[PDB]
Design an enzyme around this catalytic site. Structure first.
Site, short mmCIF file in Angstrom:
data_model
loop_
_atom_site.label_atom_id
_atom_site.label_comp_id
_atom_site.label_asym_id
_atom_site.label_seq_id
_atom_site.Cartn_x
_atom_site.Cartn_y
_atom_site.Cartn_z
N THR A 133 -0.40 -0.01 4.13
CA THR A 133 -1.20 -1.20 4.44
C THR A 133 -0.60 -2.02 5.59
OG1 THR A 133 -1.08 -1.36 2.02
CG2 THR A 133 -2.75 -2.70 3.14
N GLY A 176 1.14 -0.05 8.28
CA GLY A 176 1.30 0.87 9.38
C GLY A 176 1.59 2.28 8.90
N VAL A 177 1.77 3.18 9.85
CA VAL A 177 2.02 4.57 9.53
C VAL A 177 3.37 4.73 8.82
CG1 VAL A 177 3.24 5.29 11.61
CG2 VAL A 177 1.74 6.89 10.41
N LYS A 233 8.86 3.44 7.73
CA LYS A 233 7.66 2.64 7.81
C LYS A 233 7.68 1.76 9.07
CE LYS A 233 4.73 -0.30 4.98
NZ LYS A 233 4.60 -1.03 3.69
N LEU A 276 10.72 10.21 -1.34
CA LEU A 276 10.35 10.90 -2.58
C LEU A 276 9.25 11.88 -2.22
CD1 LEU A 276 11.42 8.03 -3.69
CD2 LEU A 276 10.82 8.97 -5.95
N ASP A 283 0.20 -5.23 -5.02
CA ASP A 283 -0.70 -4.15 -4.63
C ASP A 283 -0.33 -2.77 -5.22
OD1 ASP A 283 -2.99 -3.11 -3.45
OD2 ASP A 283 -1.92 -2.63 -1.57
BR1 LIG Z 1 8.85 4.30 0.99
C1 LIG Z 1 8.37 6.03 0.57
C2 LIG Z 1 9.23 7.09 0.24
N1 LIG Z 1 8.55 8.20 0.00
N2 LIG Z 1 7.21 7.84 0.13
C3 LIG Z 1 6.09 8.61 -0.04
N3 LIG Z 1 6.28 9.93 -0.40
C4 LIG Z 1 5.15 10.70 -0.96
C5 LIG Z 1 4.77 11.79 0.01
C6 LIG Z 1 5.74 12.66 0.51
C7 LIG Z 1 5.35 13.67 1.39
C8 LIG Z 1 4.02 13.75 1.77
N4 LIG Z 1 3.07 12.93 1.31
C9 LIG Z 1 3.45 11.98 0.45
C10 LIG Z 1 4.88 7.97 0.19
C11 LIG Z 1 4.81 6.59 0.55
C12 LIG Z 1 3.52 5.91 0.77
C13 LIG Z 1 3.30 4.63 0.26
C14 LIG Z 1 2.08 3.97 0.45
C15 LIG Z 1 1.04 4.60 1.13
C16 LIG Z 1 1.23 5.90 1.61
C17 LIG Z 1 2.46 6.55 1.44
N5 LIG Z 1 5.90 5.87 0.69
C18 LIG Z 1 7.09 6.52 0.48
#
Ligand SMILES: Brc1cnn2c(NCc3cccnc3)cc(-c3ccccc3)nc12
Length: 279
Positions: free
Chosen positions: A14, A16-17, A33, A75, A119
């Site tokens: 929410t 950025g990439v 992030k 993770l 959220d």
């Molecule tokens: Br900090 C963070 C550390 N790992 N992570 C992951 N890992 C899950 C993952 C790993 C490999 C491929 N696809 C998904 C997703 C998101 C995230 C949080 C919010 C929105 C989108 C992604 N944030 C994080």
């Protein structure tokens, strides 16, 4: 930033990439992030100290070129993807219970430090091969954004909502894990609010003192009757339904706290199973 090699985008947060990345130095694999106001920097800086086994660790905060980069522990999978993968037979109850338990522990921690998530959603609940589940993006709040997990007090324009909003979100996620379908999949604020009323009954002064004074409350809201949880989350057992009901209390002051929830009879037989993760 030149200290990292982007491996792949792993979603679009929410803010950025979000990239899986490698520290060109230590070789460490992290989540990067890309998000500056002093308030932001100080607040985020506090987050680096909020460490707990059920909160994704914030490794470093990089501020450069007026740019803000947050480096997190990585993770491999998130709960949405896992729920989608366990869609056929559903997530085994002992694993649901374990996850709910762990998340309540993470919440209790943050809440004791007056930090809210605000959220919570399956996409930001991260899992590993050891049966751990962790909260991602905690304290950050302080593509269409999903309203499915939003508490009613937020939807009714409460400006100073508290920790109870996270309990609500976690209740919706618990239900979704159990039934394999989103509890309240609204596609607009009023749709979300009405989906909640249709299931839990239109709130009133009896169950939620002061609700009629809320900023966005309208006397013209349709008055629907509340449904039995037995119909809402079959075949969740009585302990599970009882806990769920308390996590979905309309009044935020009546809503069960994370700490109280951990003591609920539902967790009497809690264990820590290993999910089958196909990375
Ligand atoms: Br900090 C963070 C550390 N790992 N992570 C992951 N890992 C899950 C993952 C790993 C490999 C491929 N696809 C998904 C997703 C998101 C995230 C949080 C919010 C929105 C989108 C992604 N944030 C994080």
């Amino acid at each position: 930033m030149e200290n990292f090699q982007k491996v792949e985008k792993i979603g679009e947060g929410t803010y950025g990439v979000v990239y899986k990345a490698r520290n060109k130095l230590t070789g460490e694999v992290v989540a990067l992030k890309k998000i500056v106001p002093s308030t932001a920097i100080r607040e985020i800086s506090l987050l680096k100290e909020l460490n707990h086994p059920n909160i994704v660790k914030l490794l470093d905060v990089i501020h450069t070129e007026n740019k803000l980069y947050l480096v997190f522990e990585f993770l491999h999978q998130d709960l949405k993807k896992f729920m989608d993968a366990s869609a056929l037979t559903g997530i085994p109850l002992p694993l649901i219970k374990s996850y709910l338990f762990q998340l309540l522990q993470g919440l209790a921690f943050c809440h004791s430090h007056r930090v809210l998530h605000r959220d919570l959603k399956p996409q930001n609940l991260l899992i590993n091969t050891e049966g751990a589940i962790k909260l991602a993006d905690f304290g950050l709040a302080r593509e269409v954004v999903t309203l499915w997990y939003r508490a009613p007090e937020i939807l009714l324009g409460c400006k100073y909502y508290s920790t109870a909003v996270d309990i609500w979100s976690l209740g919706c996620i618990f239900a979704e894990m159990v039934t394999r379908r989103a509890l309240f999949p609204g596609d607009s604020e009023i749709d979300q609010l009405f989906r909640i009323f249709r299931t839990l009954g239109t709130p009133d002064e009896v169950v939620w003192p002061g609700v009629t004074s809320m900023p966005d409350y309208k006397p013209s809201f349709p008055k629907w009757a509340r449904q039995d949880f037995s119909k809402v989350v079959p075949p969740l057992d009585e302990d599970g339904r009882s806990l769920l009901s308390q996590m979905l209390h309309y009044d935020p002051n009546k809503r069960i706290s994370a700490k109280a929830a951990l003591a609920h009879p539902f967790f009497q037989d809690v264990t820590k199973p290993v999910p089958h993760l196909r990375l």
